[PDB]
TrEMBL record:
UniProt xrefs under SUPFAM superfamilies: DNA polymerase III theta subunit-like
Signal peptide (residue range): none
InterPro entries: DNA_pol_III_theta_bac (IPR009052), PolIII_theta_sf (IPR036745)
Gene name of the encoded protein: hot
One family name in Pfam for this protein: DNA_pol3_theta
Native organism taxonomy: Viruses, Duplodnaviria, Heunggongvirae, Uroviricota, Caudoviricetes
Protein name as it appears in the record: Hot
Amino acid sequence: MYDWNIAAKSQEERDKVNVDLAASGVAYKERLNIPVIAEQVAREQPENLRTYFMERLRHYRQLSLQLPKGSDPAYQKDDAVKK
């Protein structure tokens, strides 16, 4: 699907988000089922925001488990059966 955050005009804005979406594709896609390419963001990941990407990344992990199908043990329903 290529880039999508083209709405970012400023430099500081596009860089932080480019690395933000990067952290998403890498984990969010492999965990749940988000349709994106991990290496696609790997070639556009600004080392200048390597810190931010990790912040969102670590966060994405927390939701990786909470998120829908793909990897969720505690996503049971009615507290009766787990699925």
